[PDB]
Design a protein around this nucleic acid. Structure first.
Ligand SMILES: Nc1nc2c(ncn2[C@@H]2O[C@H](COP(=O)(O)OP(=O)(O)OP(=O)(O)O)[C@@H](O)[C@H]2O)c(=O)[nH]1
Ligand SMILES: Nc1nc2c(ncn2[C@@H]2O[C@H](COP(=O)(O)OP(=O)(O)OP(=O)(O)O)[C@@H](O)[C@H]2O)c(=O)[nH]1
Ligand SMILES: Nc1ccn([C@@H]2O[C@H](COP(=O)(O)OP(=O)(O)OP(=O)(O)O)[C@@H](O)[C@H]2O)c(=O)n1
Lengths: 1198, 21, 498, 16
RNA sequence: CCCCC
RNA sequence: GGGGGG
């Protein structure tokens, strides 16, 4: 009492006292809300008005908290803020507010009678502020605020910091919280009606702003400038102002980097190795400088007057490139709260998906040949932008035909539907339907393809699809307008599948695809670091607006003319449901019809382009069924942006030949497109590259896209992941720790806690101070998730608490006579966060019996089975070897509660919930097999692969689970997660033995295995310092990432191990190429029993190209060998540092005598490379000499 | 006197393949 | 065959191919009737499908297979004992007609076999298979034609009721020919449509009409303008566009012919509109129809609006494609024009000039071309250079939503208080999809016209009309479902009401 | 010495 | 489960 | 709703 005065707050170490003390405090926060309100609104807190300190770069700032009067005094709700059309078929055309208006909650009511136009609208706004606002990654939103504010108390050891007064000023009204969310109704509920309607979203704003303070992007002073900017945006519409201002306040850095003038940056080479630093000027080209003038008058208006002076402060003071990226990262968290944006679906539907024509119209191709309906068949452009793209793409048409013939498309279409189910196909229309339990699988793709089987080959199947409106789904994303996506029916999607298969064939023929492949390491952006380092370059990252609304009906035909010529040469008889037959056909210049042979796909490509209706219907609770106007790009029939990627690269490379006829040699290097995002690289003189740069800006305007052309000499953007002079800059705000779209909140823990590790490791190089994230996400795991919501039966409810109370405390509800179930809430010790297949969260130093603390883990520590080593390290491995004992030291582990941490892990709670559902919910037998036995009849017969799969099992070795044979998959396709139904009484019916193992627990022990001796290696610091590799000399100033600033431990880790391998990352990318876990499960075959690898091919049914990748992927991979002692390092968790453990062998020494004669020399490097990453905090230039446990070597030879 | 060719669609197709200057 | 002649010959009655009275031929087709009872029996076993369609195609079509777990192979051995009894010299052949109407009635189980076979495809002409084919010549009577000079006794041309069926092209009533010359021992094929050839500009032209010759008053030598309103609804030109059709074309030959089955896809998009008309879950049903200018679409949709008005009983609105074009010419200067529905219908009259025709007249005078001959004389490059300037006057109205802008025009009209619940809107090119709104239904409409000849026929607008046609045709690829006018009238009869 | 200071000192000596 | 259109 | 990668 309280968290800023704890012994853990001052030493930042666990002990037998402070760790048992910090458990009592955080468990008290998550358990009872009355303690939470006293924590957040405590009287001892002092209010702050004027404040002063240092900014992000050490310059002194003075800011003052200012809360606008319009939140303390919300205006009464105004009916005119959401006008309607006179017919009241929809919202009025022009309208200001797509999102919430700020108003007092008690001013919104509906006196109108039910089933009236105005009654349904007020019911929608009541559905708005009370439903859409709550989006929380964990538990209640108040517990999420506690974990952030609790982290700020422990980190600064002070109750007095500016961010707290924003909480005490806004949310302190009455004795209780202004509002609480009830999980039962999935609604926020207001206890005080005078509160402003927008306030609940601001709890997510402080949770984001409090993350940046722990992160080190924002300091206490810059936090004040940020919070006022959001409260200024709360009038009059909190999200409309953010979406309007966000473009201007992030773009200023161009002019500020112009004033830095000279700067020294590392120069990357082609191979992703740093070859040196270079002193380059950062002056922008003259035409870039003239665009600064238009921004200044615009930044003086829309921006907040105090936040505007902050950017004027940045353009002045900063003198080095590191200072600019620090001011830029600071502006990033002031312009975005990181929350998912949300509205009523039809309010945002207007401007998001409504088609819009801009600049010139697109004109038709000439029709060389036509169907008897006068549908197009093959066509060509006389002139226009469509002729420009065809001058390029026409040379690829013939080669694609040789590859389309090889694929057996019916085998592909059945495999294409398997990759993503359920597809939310329209539900069963009428009686019976037979059925009858297929309605339980009614929302699926493969199930709907199986039910409609005889229907597959009928041509009539396609015309039945044309009567079905295309339902509109909305997928929200951070800091962006709400997106309108279009789901499609099986046959409706099937019409576009043939054009898609031609569309992805081009990727092998070019380097123009940014979507080609991605590894997730620094090699992903690796080419960008090369071009940013070069002399005489004009970089250009052209984002394109719209693309959903920017493709008019006539624009799509540019892509059709490419597919129609490819489908013309392709010979693919009986694609189904179609024939390779003759046809009566009209030609240009001939009077009467001619007789031309036609293959199957050329019909299916023609029929799809002939009928096109992109209108997306949506059924709403207000206006009935609303239908968006035609002219959208559906996003997406079959697949996209494979439509856009062939469309953009043909518009760009074809412009190069358009300049060839004009006689101007076209300076250019390489060009990546995802799409729709484009990126270009122009090398040449400053005058010539601008002339070619203007042409690419104009040709896209001529084809109907409007874009914001960006040009710079020293910076570039791609995938919203930008690079400057070979210096990666992260985006902190894009990761939203505290919100999610699904509102999927459930008490299952390995689902949530292991997911949180994916986020904290994705913030490793997007943050300046990683050490603060560890204290942040610990308290998030120490508070937001300490309870378990399992439903108990009234019979067994009294038997459980009689034993488990000895270790882990839990909640005891009085038995309820009314209903059968009596709930329990299972609190867990903090120790569960650190155990294997627990949280696996990085740990603070512990206290041994000797008093020496264990090593302080960093963000780079691997997870998986390696986390179990922390158990032995508490027992002092250096003492364990001198006594030659493998004893586990169970007594000390009972103190911290590891003994109880493993009791929850022995329940296998997430494994029983799956097994209990598989019994009854899936009938299998005749119900499921009849569809799988039928579904096999469409595939090119046959996959008997289970006979080729179990051939690997006996004997043979076990393999698991699904790499092939998806006719066991439709069983899994019914998850029945919502809800758990009545089967939970049978889920705990098998747990009657699991409370019979707690009476059988008696004195509990932690199990050990003979394979567990591997943990007993521990290193002892030596004396001689390590000579350092040259990369540190180049990166020592103007550092390439926020946490790699000079002298920071994240920089020093790259200095010791070095960068990622060349051939290793290109090769490991290929095992993920076939996938679109198979690598490791099949790798034990390559090491122990190699002859099973050949049948490993035919059990997966991999092709000859896929067979040679897995053989070639074991070549450069086996240099660091197999894991008998496995570890998990995410490629996102690393980024620049070397992945191959061999790199760490240089900085550690081993005695020769420890090696086995011809075996396992390469295993000690995993013992070393995994250890240096675990503790870079205490590492300071020391060569290491490992010692081995005497019983470890006896195990290795056995 | 008139020809199938003077029609705009016909003229355009042609323009499709002996494109003149 | 695919479809089985013996269980239901009424489908082949439509094509006019009759079974021979009852040799290898007759014994063979009775085998096919047994196989269709068998394949239908295996259908119901597994959700209406087969099991190993490539295995059935080897047995039935090739005949090289003999079959002898019992669970999976029980259906095949039952097939093998049946086919092996036939002792055929080779396997049976699968047959399919080119017509889509024949394909739409094929059973589901036959389609599963087709992909693993090489069906013999019999080409059609105008919805009618050629009778010279090897199979149709053996199983069916060969139709015999009777024309003017060809009319004679049965004795002059050796014929029997067994071998031959008689087709009557003479145009005299069939009851007379059947009763007078003794042809009552032969069965006459009947045709409910007409195939009328016309003299065109570029050359001879044919056509198909869905009405019977008695109901269409046209005879040999008749003027095209006579009974023109009937042809526009039920006619289909079957020659490549442009055709030769003119206002002064004359008939040459008229014969009875098979009726045109409506396109399966065109009925699907139109019934999607009718589903929005009946149900109360939708507030506004709105059909959009594009057509090349000069097709006479306003003449057809004036009646099609009335036919739909009799069915649902709701008041159906109508807006000609030039409704906005004339209204923009009037109110471009007035700041706050009325958008009331009947006021816009008052401006749809042909006498008023469209705004687009005014701006295009200046653009032709700017190069000084007022003559049709001077416009036809121009090279294609000279015309395309001008149409890009007409694209600039058009994007100016679609670029944004302003009070005089075209998108706000259709917004205020559709969402007006007194406007009809269902609307029918016309448009000139695909790029107007963003403006006229907001619909899930859109269709092209192909009349029987040579619109580029129809523009030369009309003498009022002259070159200004012909020039706007190509400016719209250049921006109107056929990217939407095609719909002949008779299919829309056919769409209303099939849909059930109330 | 703080760890950073030791790290910086080590860096300077090698690269003088 | 995350990153991205 | 589909595609890219752990
Ligand atoms: N009435 C009320 N309900 C709340 C409040 N806060 C959260 N709730 C939710 O409403 C339900 C019933 O309210 P309470 O009995 O007060 O729950 P509580 O005091 O928050 O206790 P816990 O549910 O264990 O957190 C609970 O399941 C909570 O999820 C609150 O302040 N008042
Ligand atoms: N004689 C003559 N009649 C004309 C002329 N222009 C229009 N018409 C009349 O237009 C009628 C044909 O109407 P439609 O074919 O529907 O022409 P529309 O109403 O403009 O419809 P769209 O061509 O699709 O725009 C004929 O009956 C003529 O009376 C002309 O220049 N000369
Ligand atoms: N889940 C989604 C959503 C839509 N699309 C693609 O997303 C594109 C639209 O991008 P969007 O972000 O909505 O527009 P912009 O903001 O302008 O995109 P950008 O800034 O990257 O240019 C469309 O081409 C569509 O193909 C997709 O493939 N994946």
């Amino acid at each position: 009492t309280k968290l800023h005065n704890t012994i853990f707050s001052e030493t930042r170490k666990f002990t037998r006292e402070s760790f048992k003390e910090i458990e009592h405090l955080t468990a008290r926060l998550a358990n009872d809300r009355v303690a939470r309100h006293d924590f957040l609104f405590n009287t001892s807190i002092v209010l702050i008005s004027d404040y002063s300190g240092e900014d992000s770069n050490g310059n002194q700032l003075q800011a003052t908290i200012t809360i606008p009067n319009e939140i303390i005094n919300p205006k009464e709700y105004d009916p005119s803020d959401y006008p309607l059309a006179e017919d009241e078929s929809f919202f009025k055309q022009g309208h200001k507010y797509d999102y919430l208006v700020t108003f007092r909650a008690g001013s919104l009511t509906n006196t109108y009678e039910p089933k009236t136009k105005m009654y349904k609208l007020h019911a929608a706004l009541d559905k708005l502020m009370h439903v859409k606002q709550r989006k929380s990654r964990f538990a209640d939103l108040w517990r999420e605020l506690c974990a952030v504010i609790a982290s700020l108390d422990v980190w600064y050891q002070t109750t007095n910091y500016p961010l707290r007064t924003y909480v005490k000023l806004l949310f302190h009204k009455g004795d209780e919280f202004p509002f609480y969310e009830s999980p039962s109704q999935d609604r926020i509920i207001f206890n005080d009606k005078s509160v402003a309607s927008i306030l609940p979203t601001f709890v997510y704003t402080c949770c984001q702003v409090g993350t940046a303070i722990m992160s080190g992007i924002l300091t206490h002073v810059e936090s004040i400038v940020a919070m006022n900017h959001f409260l200024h945006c709360a009038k009059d519409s909190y999200i409309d102002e953010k979406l309007k201002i966000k473009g201007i306040g992030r773009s200023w850095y161009q002019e500020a980097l112009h004033n830095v003038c000279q700067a020294t940056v590392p120069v990357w080479s082609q191979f992703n190795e740093v070859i040196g630093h270079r002193t380059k000027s950062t002056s922008e080209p003259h035409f870039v400088s003239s665009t600064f003038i238009s921004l200044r008058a615009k930044r003086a208006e829309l921006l907040y007057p105090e936040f505007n002076a902050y950017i004027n402060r940045a353009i002045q003071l900063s003198k080095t490139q590191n200072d600019v990226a620090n001011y830029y990262a600071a502006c990033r968290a002031m312009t975005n709260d990181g929350t998912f944006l949300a509205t009523l679906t039809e309010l945002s539907l207007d401007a998001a998906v409504f088609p819009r024509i801009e600049q010139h119209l697109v004109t038709r191709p000439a029709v060389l040949m036509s169907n008897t309906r006068h549908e197009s068949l093959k066509q060509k452009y006389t002139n226009g932008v469509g002729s420009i793209a065809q001058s390029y793409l026409s040379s690829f048409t013939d080669e694609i035909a040789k590859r389309v013939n090889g694929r057996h498309h019916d085998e592909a279409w059945l495999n294409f539907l398997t990759t993503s189910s359920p597809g939310r196909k329209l539900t069963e229309i009428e009686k019976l339907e037979v059925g009858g339990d297929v309605a339980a699988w009614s929302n699926s793709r493969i199930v709907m393809q199986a039910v409609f089987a005889r229907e597959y080959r009928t041509p009539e199947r396609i015309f039945k699809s044309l009567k079905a409106p295309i339902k509109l789904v909305e997928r929200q994303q951070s800091d962006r307008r709400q997106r309108a996506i279009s789901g499609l029916d099986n046959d409706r999607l099937f019409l576009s599948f043939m054009p898609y298969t031609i569309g992805k064939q081009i990727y092998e023929l070019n380097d123009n695809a940014a979507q080609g492949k991605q590894a997730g390491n620094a090699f992903d952006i690796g080419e960008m670091l090369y071009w940013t380092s070069q002399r005489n370059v004009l970089l250009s990252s052209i984002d394109v607006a719209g693309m959903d609304a920017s493709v008019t009906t006539n624009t799509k035909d540019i892509y059709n003319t490419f597919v129609l010529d490819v489908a013309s040469k392709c010979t693919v008889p009986r694609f189904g449901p179609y024939y390779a037959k003759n046809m009566e056909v009209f030609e240009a210049g001939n009077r009467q019809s001619q007789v031309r042979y036609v293959n199957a796909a050329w019909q299916a490509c023609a029929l799809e382009a002939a009928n096109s209706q992109t209108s997306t219907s949506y059924e709403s609770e207000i206006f009935g069924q609303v239908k968006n106007a035609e002219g959208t790009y559906p996003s997406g029939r079959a697949d996209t942006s494979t439509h856009h990627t062939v469309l953009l690269q043909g518009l760009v490379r074809g412009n190069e030949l358009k300049r060839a006829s004009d006689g101007k040699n076209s300076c250019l290097a390489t060009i990546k497109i995802l799409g729709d995002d484009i990126m270009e690289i122009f090398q040449g003189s400053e005058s010539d590259t601008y002339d070619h740069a203007v042409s690419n800006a104009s040709i896209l305007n001529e084809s109907g896209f409007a874009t914001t052309a960006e040009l710079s000499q020293n910076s570039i953007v791609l995938l919203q992941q930008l690079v400057v002079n070979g210096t990666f800059w992260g985006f902190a705000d894009r990761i939203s720790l505290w919100t999610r779209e699904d509102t999927k909140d459930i008490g299952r823990l390995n689902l949530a806690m292991m997911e949180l590790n994916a986020l904290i490791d994705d913030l490793v190089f997007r943050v300046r101070r990683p050490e603060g994230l560890k204290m942040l996400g610990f308290f998030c795991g120490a508070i937001c998730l300490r309870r378990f919501t399992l439903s108990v039966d009234n019979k067994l409810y009294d038997s459980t608490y009689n034993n488990l109370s000895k270790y882990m405390t839990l909640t005891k509800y009085d038995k309820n006579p009314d209903s059968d179930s009596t709930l329990m809430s299972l609190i867990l010790p903090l120790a569960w966060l650190f155990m294997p297949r627990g949280g696996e969260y990085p740990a603070y130093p512990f206290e041994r019996r000797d008093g020496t603390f264990t090593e302080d883990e960093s963000m780079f520590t691997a997870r998986g089975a390696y986390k179990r080593r922390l158990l032995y390290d508490v027992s002092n491995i250096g003492e364990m070897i001198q006594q030659n004992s493998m004893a586990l030291d169970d007594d000390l582990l009972h103190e911290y509660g590891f003994t109880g941490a493993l009791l929850l892990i022995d329940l296998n709670i997430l494994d029983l919930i799956d097994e209990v559902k598989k019994e009854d919910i899936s009938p299998v037998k005749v119900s499921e097999l009849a569809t799988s036995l039928e579904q096999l009849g469409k595939l090119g017969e046959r996959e008997k692969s289970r006979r080729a799969a179990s051939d690997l099992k006996i004997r043979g070795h076990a393999l698991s689970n699904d790499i092939v044979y998806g006719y066991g998959l439709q069983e899994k396709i019914q998850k029945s997660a919502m809800a758990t139904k009545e089967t939970t009484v049978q889920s705990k019916r098998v747990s009657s033995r699991l409370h019979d193992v707690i009476v059988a627990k008696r004195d509990y022990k932690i199990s050990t295995i003979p394979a567990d001796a591997l943990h007993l290696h521990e290193f002892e610091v030596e004396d001689v310092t390590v000579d350092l590799l040259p990369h540190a000399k180049h990166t020592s100033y103007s550092s390439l990432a926020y946490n790699m600033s000079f002298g920071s431990d994240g920089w020093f880790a790259f200095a010791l191990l070095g960068g990622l391998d060349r051939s290793a990352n290109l090769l490991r990318l290929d095992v993920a190429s076939i996938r679109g876990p198979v690598f490791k499960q099949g790798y034990k075959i390559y090491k122990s029993d190699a002859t099973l690898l050949n049948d490993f091919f035919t059990a997966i049914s991999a092709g000859p190209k896929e067979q040679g990748i897995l053989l070639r992927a074991f070549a450069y991979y086996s240099l660091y060998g197999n894991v008998e002692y496995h570890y998990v390092l995410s490629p996102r968790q690393l980024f620049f540092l070397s992945d191959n453990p061999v790199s760490a062998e240089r900085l550690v020494r081993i005695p020769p005598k420890y090696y086995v004669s011809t075996q396992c020399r390469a295993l000690y490097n995993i013992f070393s490379y995994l250890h240096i990453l675990r503790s870079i905090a205490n590492n300071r230039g020391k060569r290491l000499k490992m010692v081995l446990h005497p019983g470890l070597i006896a195990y290795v030879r056995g | 006197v008139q020809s199938r060719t003077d029609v705009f669609n016909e003229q355009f197709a042609n323009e499709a393949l002996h494109p003149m200057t | 065959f695919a479809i089985d002649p013996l269980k239901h010959s009424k489908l082949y009655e439509e094509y006019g191919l009759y079974l021979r009275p009852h040799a290898p031929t007759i014994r063979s087709i009775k085998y096919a009737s047994l196989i269709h009872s068998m394949l239908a029996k295996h259908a119901a076993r597994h959700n209406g499908t087969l099991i190993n369609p490539r295995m059935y195609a080897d047995m039935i079509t090739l005949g090289n297979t003999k079959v002898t777990d019992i669970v999976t192979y029980k259906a095949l051995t039952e097939m093998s004992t049946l086919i092996e009894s036939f002792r055929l010299p080779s396997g049976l052949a699968l047959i399919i007609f080119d017509d889509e109407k024949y394909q739409s009635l094929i059973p589901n189980y036959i389609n599963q076999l087709i992909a693993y076979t090489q069906p013999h495809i019999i080409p059609t002409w105008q919805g009618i298979a050629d009778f010279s084919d090897t199979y149709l010549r053996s199983y069916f009577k060969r139709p015999f034609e009777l024309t003017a000079s060809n009319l004679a006794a049965p004795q002059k041309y050796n014929l029997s009721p067994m071998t031959r069926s008689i087709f009557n092209n003479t145009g005299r009533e069939d009851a007379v020919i059947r009763k007078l010359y003794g042809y009552g021992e032969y069965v006459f094929i009947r045709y409910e449509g007409c195939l009328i050839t016309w003299t065109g500009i570029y050359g001879e032209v044919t056509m198909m009409v869905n009405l019977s010759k008695r109901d269409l008053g046209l005879d040999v030598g008749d003027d095209y303008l006579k009974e023109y309103k009937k042809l526009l609804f039920y006619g289909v030109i079957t020659d490549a566009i442009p055709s030769g059709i003119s206002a002064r074309s004359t008939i040459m030959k008229i014969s009875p012919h098979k009726m045109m089955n409506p396109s399966g896809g065109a009925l699907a998009v139109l019934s999607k509109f009718l589903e929005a008309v009946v149900s109360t879950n939708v507030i506004n049903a709105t059909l959009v129809v594009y057509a090349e200018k000069g097709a006479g679409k306003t003449s057809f949709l004036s009646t099609y609006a009335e036919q739909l008005s009799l069915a649902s009983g709701q008041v159906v609105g109508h807006l000609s494609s030039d409704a906005y074009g004339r209204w923009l010419a009037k109110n471009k200067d007035v700041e706050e024009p009325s958008f009331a529905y009947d006021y816009v219908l008052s401006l749809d009259t042909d006498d008023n000039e469209s705004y687009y025709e005014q701006k295009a007249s200046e653009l032709l005078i700017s190069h000084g071309i007022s003559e049709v001959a001077q416009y036809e004389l121009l090279s294609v490059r000279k015309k395309i250079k001008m149409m890009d300037e007409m694209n600039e006057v058009l994007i100016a109205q679609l670029e944004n939503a302003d009070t005089h802008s075209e998108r706000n025009f259709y917004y205020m009209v559709s969402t007006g208080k007194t406007t009809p619940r269902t609307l029918i809107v016309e448009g000139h090119f695909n790029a107007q999809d963003a403006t006229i709104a907001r619909t899930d239904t859109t269709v092209l409409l192909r009349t029987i016209n040579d619109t580029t000849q129809a523009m030369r026929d009309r003498q009022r607008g002259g070159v200004v009309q012909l020039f706007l046609r190509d400016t719209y045709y250049r921006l109107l690829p056929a990217l939407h479902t095609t719909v002949y006018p008779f299919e829309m009238l056919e769409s209303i009869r099939r849909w059930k009401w109330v | 010495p703080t760890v950073v200071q030791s790290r910086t000192d080590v860096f300077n000596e090698q690269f003088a």
